[PDB]
Design an enzyme around this catalytic site. Structure first.
Site, PDB file in Angstrom:
ATOM      1  N   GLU A 102       0.885  -1.151   0.000  1.00  0.00           N
ATOM      2  CA  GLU A 102       0.000   0.000   0.000  1.00  0.00           C
ATOM      3  C   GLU A 102       0.930   1.209   0.000  1.00  0.00           C
ATOM      4  OE1 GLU A 102      -2.326   1.209   3.667  1.00  0.00           O
ATOM      5  OE2 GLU A 102      -3.929   0.108   2.637  1.00  0.00           O
ATOM      6  N   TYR A 120       5.036  11.498  -7.438  1.00  0.00           N
ATOM      7  CA  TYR A 120       4.714  12.558  -6.481  1.00  0.00           C
ATOM      8  C   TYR A 120       3.223  12.648  -6.272  1.00  0.00           C
ATOM      9  CZ  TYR A 120       8.534  14.734  -9.540  1.00  0.00           C
ATOM     10  OH  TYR A 120       9.588  14.966 -10.412  1.00  0.00           O
ATOM     11  N   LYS A 150       4.046  17.597  -0.272  1.00  0.00           N
ATOM     12  CA  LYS A 150       4.364  16.572  -1.240  1.00  0.00           C
ATOM     13  C   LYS A 150       4.778  15.246  -0.595  1.00  0.00           C
ATOM     14  CE  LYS A 150       6.266  20.265  -4.268  1.00  0.00           C
ATOM     15  NZ  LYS A 150       7.517  21.040  -4.619  1.00  0.00           N
ATOM     16  N   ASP A 176      15.795  25.541 -13.925  1.00  0.00           N
ATOM     17  CA  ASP A 176      16.417  25.345 -12.594  1.00  0.00           C
ATOM     18  C   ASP A 176      17.836  25.920 -12.521  1.00  0.00           C
ATOM     19  OD1 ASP A 176      14.053  23.997 -11.753  1.00  0.00           O
ATOM     20  OD2 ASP A 176      14.899  22.027 -12.050  1.00  0.00           O
TER      21      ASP A 176
END
Lengths: 183, 183
Positions: B29, B133, B73, B170
């Site tokens: 899970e 994510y 997150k 970035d």
């Protein structure tokens, strides 16, 4: 973006993210709550995410949960490839007993939305496959339900010729009629 | 059993799920709403799932969203291995500017929970890595902020021995003292 394709059975949808294929690799949104609710037309909450690994020919399934533990499942394949199946098991449905089979793979990125009222199952086609799936309700053993993979009433056309490697529990699954006795 | 490990920064948690099976056949899970909520102590809803693939040395990051678009997150690595980082960027926090780094891999099945108020980033350690994510709020271009990976004020100790590959976006991230931490 995601292309939504209907299947021979209305409520069952294929979702296909069309992905970049950039230089670093890629990046996509695999699920978006607002979008998915707008697509389905009703509020849907996923409370559980599962991840599993299987060897070629392992067939898992024809599982469902009864009554209020009925689960809607949004599934996809993170690694390898599987042949996924959804069977309408709503006795009052015009498509009862009908099934839809779709190849889901890490490469094609397809997802299959299987509403409550269906049984699910899949076979691993690649050497190994890693399957991911989100559920609208928690898995509860007391509610489990199963149907034999090769049940003739449903008559799924499985892509393999060999007998699938089944778990003791799935190999002992009842035929459609028995299976839904008290439903 | 499932293990939740606290890091040097209080609100940042490492989660390592209960896995049933082998390197060749398992099931676990990866997220459970009720369990997670009980763990954190407050109601938390994830509205968006993301999936990415990156080549070795690709470093993605030091991302966050401001104010009301601030995201929590829950991240993990389904394929390969990455070195994941969370940076506390709450100006009033006693651990402001501090960071935590954790290796997340398909093998160890670790997950990192990074609350709102933190910036996030990671570097791919394996030939390729596929990262997953779950966010508590939707991406928001207007609300996004970034911090350069090698910012000295934060001082992250990146494990890689080679120069990282960065997206144009970035590579152009500002230094901490210049980041727009607040709306």
């Amino acid at each position: 973006m995601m292309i939504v394709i209907k299947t021979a059975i209305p409520d069952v949808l294929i979702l296909e993210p069309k992905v970049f294929g950039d230089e670093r690799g890629f990046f996509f949104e695999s699920y978006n709550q607002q979008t998915f609710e707008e697509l389905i037309g009703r509020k849907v909450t996923f409370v559980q995410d599962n991840h599993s690994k299987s060897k070629k020919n392992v067939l898992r399934g024809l599982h469902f949960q009864r009554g209020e533990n009925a689960q809607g499942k949004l599934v996809r394949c993170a690694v390898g490839e599987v042949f996924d199946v959804a069977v309408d098991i709503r006795k009052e449905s015009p498509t009862f007993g009908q099934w839809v089979g779709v190849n889901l793979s890490a490469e094609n990125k397809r997802q299959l939305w299987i509403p409550e009222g269906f049984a699910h199952g899949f076979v691993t086609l690649s050497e190994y496959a890693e399957f991911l799936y989100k559920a609208t309700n928690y898995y509860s053993p007391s509610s489990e339900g199963s149907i034999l993979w090769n049940d003739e009433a449903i008559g799924i056309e499985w892509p393999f010729s060999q007998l699938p490697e089944l778990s003791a529990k799935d190999a002992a699954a009842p035929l459609l009629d028995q299976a839904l006795l008290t439903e």
